Amino acid sequence: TELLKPRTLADLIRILHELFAGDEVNVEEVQAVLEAYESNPAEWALYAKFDQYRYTRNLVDQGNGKFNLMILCWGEGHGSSIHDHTDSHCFLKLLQGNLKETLFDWPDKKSNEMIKKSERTLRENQCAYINDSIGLHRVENVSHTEPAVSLHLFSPPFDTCHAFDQRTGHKNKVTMTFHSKFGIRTP
Ligand SMILES: [Cl-]
Ligand SMILES: [Fe+2]
Ligand code: NA
Ligand code: NA
Ligand code: NA
């Protein structure tokens, strides 16, 4: 329960394996530790694999079954769907650039446009947190000039979630695909 500042990405990962050694999750502590790591591009260049047309998901660590740690790479103008997180914890730390996070409420059964609840700009080294009881969100690199890179921790791991149609609130199931694993391209 003694949180030290992660010196490196590797150190961070080791501290995370400690924090998730058990069955439950201290959210505020995981968030603090993630925010405390100072992004060092050299340490994660291996995982920062971009695609021209959409954002990529790059597996960094499998957290001995308790979590998935991954790096997402967002080209200029790349963004996600409005999505949930499959009853898991979601931590999002910026390693490079900025991302816009837009919050949505869970839709009612009636077909209505999903109106934004709020939005915020996540900046380098900032760490955000979301879960399904908080709501839904969309994440976007709105920059025309700067690629964005983020570090995501999901616990428990999941490889499916829902995307929501902003016009209706209708949801469809989506399967998450890894662009790379441990620095190896996995087409
Ligand atoms: Cl996310
Ligand atoms: Fe998300
Ligand atoms: Na490292
Ligand atoms: Na650091
Ligand atoms: Na995209």
Ligand code: NA
């Ligand atoms: Na990309």
Ligand code: NA
């Ligand atoms: Na991907």
Ligand code: NA
């Ligand atoms: Na950016």
Ligand code: NA
């Ligand atoms: Na957004």
Ligand code: NA
């Ligand atoms: Na959610």
Ligand code: NA
């Ligand atoms: Na479903």
Ligand code: NA
């Ligand atoms: Na990878």
